[PDB]
Amino acid sequence: KDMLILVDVSGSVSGLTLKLIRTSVSEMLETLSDDDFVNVASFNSNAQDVSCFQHLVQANVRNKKVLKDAVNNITAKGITDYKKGFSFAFEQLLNYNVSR
């Protein structure tokens, strides 16, 4: 695979929905092998990477833990923009300068 997990951390997901989203993203990462490359991005009126990774990294144990911690540390705030999040996701899937 080449996932970009787009997480919708806007105001409307606060409380239970954010808890379910972060557990779901962790369990989604737990299905990624070492041949899959993954990044996790979050958008609320502007998209950003949840972690220090700026591109699709290999989905090995240590990178997956980095992404899991970044997702667990994520907070809900702001308005949603599905265009600035999908722009970010599609741009990151077109980044061929990195291992994929």
Binding site: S10, G11, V13, A76, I79, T80
Partner: protein, 49 residues
């Protein structure tokens, strides 16, 4: 009666609004918040008269 109708319209606009947790806003809330100056203007008009 036009004042009564605009008052009912203001009440309907207030009823139509939805509140989201942490700064999020529904797309319709933007329109229902941009419709305010008409109501404040009509109420200033009744006050002036």
């Amino acid at each position: 009666y036009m004042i009564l109708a605009t008052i009912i319209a203001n009440c309907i606009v207030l009823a139509l609004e939805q509140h989201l947790p942490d700064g999020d806003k529904t797309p319709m809330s933007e329109r229902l918040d941009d419709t305010e100056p008409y109501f404040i203007g009509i109420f200033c008009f009744e006050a002036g008269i």
